[PDB]
Write an enzyme that holds these catalytic residues in place. Structure first.
Site, PDB file in Angstrom:
ATOM      1  N   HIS A  41       0.978  -1.209  -0.010  1.00 58.05           N
ATOM      2  CA  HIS A  41       0.006  -0.089  -0.047  1.00 58.05           C
ATOM      3  C   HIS A  41       0.808   1.324   0.023  1.00 58.05           C
ATOM      4  O   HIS A  41       0.287   2.480   0.035  1.00 58.05           O
ATOM      5  CB  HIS A  41      -1.343  -0.132   1.109  1.00 58.05           C
ATOM      6  CG  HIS A  41      -0.588   0.195   2.588  1.00 58.05           C
ATOM      7  ND1 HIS A  41      -0.568  -0.636   3.269  1.00 58.05           N
ATOM      8  CD2 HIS A  41      -0.322   1.292   3.018  1.00 58.05           C
ATOM      9  CE1 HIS A  41      -0.229  -0.182   4.442  1.00 58.05           C
ATOM     10  NE2 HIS A  41       0.236   0.966   4.456  1.00 58.05           N
ATOM     11  N   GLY A 143       2.502   6.480   9.615  1.00 61.39           N
ATOM     12  CA  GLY A 143       3.976   6.346   9.108  1.00 61.39           C
ATOM     13  C   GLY A 143       4.822   5.197   9.638  1.00 61.39           C
ATOM     14  O   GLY A 143       5.861   4.754   9.481  1.00 61.39           O
ATOM     15  N   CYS A 145       3.648   1.968   9.271  1.00 61.81           N
ATOM     16  CA  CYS A 145       3.373   0.803   8.435  1.00 61.81           C
ATOM     17  C   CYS A 145       4.827   0.357   7.827  1.00 61.81           C
ATOM     18  O   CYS A 145       5.776   1.232   7.733  1.00 61.81           O
ATOM     19  CB  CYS A 145       2.497   0.959   7.207  1.00 61.81           C
ATOM     20  SG  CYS A 145       0.909   0.865   7.703  1.00 61.81           S
TER      21      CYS A 145
END
Ligand code: KS0
Ligand code: KS0
Lengths: 304, 304
Positions: A41, A143, A145
């Protein structure tokens, strides 16, 4: 003595953290050998997350569109490919800080350490358990991930988790290092509710053994029970049913303390039916389930 | 979101851990520049600990009697000296992995991360607080002496603790990096009881703000209180009295949530007088006090 929610030393993982930017989105990546692993993603814009067609989005991306920075040095991207929900960016340099590692898919009820990262930089480390409903209860802001979960066996890092999302319920979901999500979760901003989360019975028992080892003995009683009787109580209180395999992993702790596994089950039964009566066990006012029997042995013996 | 007892990434400290052996005793050392810091009781035999005369014992020791090993490589000892309860072993090589560092003496109520070590090798990391009675509630087995506590400000490691002992009560005592013990504790195997341990009021309030930020709001009420009224309740329940300075450090959290510090005090008052009624706050069934207002801001903003 003393008992703490202890994480593995995060050093070997810190040296693998990088920052991955694609367009406007920035998240964390994991650099092992000449490959950088990150959530797919990273190619999405906040707008796309409602229903992204990852294959269609990735076609518009080239190796030069993925900016990978290790601290202050830029990595050159020579390959890109999507494996399930993770992207693998082949870079021209092997990570000099790559430790001995494995990619393993953990079982529900197992524990792991999470090195929370922002912009490729580590902020902190904590101990987590993969819940029976395949979610984790972490601490992750925007932030984060790409932050990874791992276990360490002397010099070998076994990566087991990569953080992908927070559900609207505030719980966390992610993948193994092959990009496969734990549980039914998808990398999409949709209604996703975790199933009923049961309490990990074998970990509660192992933590009860840890309390007996470290001084807390008030909860011990003159009773015993059987696997079938205990499981009637475990079902009422949304606890995992105990199996002979669970009894066997508790063997070391049963032998060290001299308290039979079924006797400890009877103590657990009475705590479920009567509560703690305002008392504490190892500084906790509830029944802790994020310590596996292996975690208790390790902490009570000093394995480095 | 989510809230965890998060430790600092231990990487910069792992590269400083060494093994120090003197005679039959082996414990941990901290190698920074060309100096190795370790507890002075490394020169003691279990027999000596009843009443050791450290000056007399150290006279029988030469530089060659201190074996310092960094993983698999032996360090050459060119100097030795005792500063309070720590030994400083000057070695012929600066640690190539020395990070930017400071030695700081923390205040009671402050928090720090502990990197538990055995034979100079790290086993795990956890978050601790220096209790108001100057003890810590850690997890330390034999061979863990010399393990250090620290805080990290971006790239600078501030070492604040060195582990020296477990009291017969199972609580832990140690020194700052100048060898001065926190509290009245001595490096001797004698009857040493910690004073009354009070609950760190400002940390409980900061953790209540963290619960409000992360969703848990059941404990909020229609009441307010004053510093003097709250402190009557805090004294009854062995809580630290709240000062205007405590109110001021809670400023950021008060401003972000929009809940006045005294209003949150009234919520805390009601929780002290009525308990949790079987409910939980941030997964805990008791009032957590090992998160400073600084820890809450850091975790709720993602400082790396
Ligand atoms: C890396 C994913 C993650 O944990 N976060 C980024 C997005 N955050 C906000 C959020 C919460 C819940 C949702 F349904 C979507 C987005 C939380 C932290
Ligand atoms: C490094 C000091 C430490 O924490 N330990 C070593 C000695 N251990 C046993 C012990 C406990 C209590 C005493 F009064 C003396 C010795 C515990 C761990």
């Amino acid at each position: 003595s003393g008992f703490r929610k202890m994480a593995f030393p995060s050093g070997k993982v810190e040296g693998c953290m990088v920052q991955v930017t694609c367009g406007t989105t920035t998240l964390n990546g994991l650099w092992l050998d000449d490959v950088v692993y990150c959530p797919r993603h990273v190619i999405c814009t906040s707008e796309d997350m409602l229903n992204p067609n990852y294959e269609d989005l990735l076609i518009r991306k080239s190796n030069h569109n993925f900016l990978v920075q290790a601290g202050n040095v830029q990595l050159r991207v020579i390959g890109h490919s999507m494996q399930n929900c993770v992207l693998k960016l082949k870079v021209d340099t092997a990570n000099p800080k790559t430790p001995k590692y494995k990619f393993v898919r953990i079982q529900p009820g197992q524990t792991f350490s999470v090195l929370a990262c922002y912009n490729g930089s580590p902020s902190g480390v904590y101990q987590c358990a993969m819940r029976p409903n395949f979610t984790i209860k972490g601490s992750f802001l925007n932030g984060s991930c790409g932050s990874v979960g791992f276990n360490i066996d002397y010099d070998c890092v076994s990566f087991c988790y990569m953080h992908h999302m927070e559900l609207p319920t505030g719980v966390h979901a992610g993948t193994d290092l092959e990009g496969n999500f734990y549980g039914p979760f998808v990398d999409r901003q949709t209604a996703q509710a975790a199933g009923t989360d049961t309490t990990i019975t074998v970990n509660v028992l192992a933590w009860l053994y840890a309390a007996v080892i470290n001084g807390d003995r008030w909860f011990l009683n003159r009773f015993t029970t059987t696997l079938n009787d205990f499981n009637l109580v475990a079902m009422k209180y949304n606890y995992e049913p105990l199996t002979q395999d669970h009894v066997d992993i508790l063997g070391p702790l049963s032998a060290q303390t001299g308290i039979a596994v079924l006797d400890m089950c009877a103590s657990l039964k009475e705590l479920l039916q009567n509560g703690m009566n305002g008392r504490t066990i190892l500084g906790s006012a509830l029944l802790e389930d994020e310590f596996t029997p292996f975690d208790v042995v390790r902490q009570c013996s000093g394995v480095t």
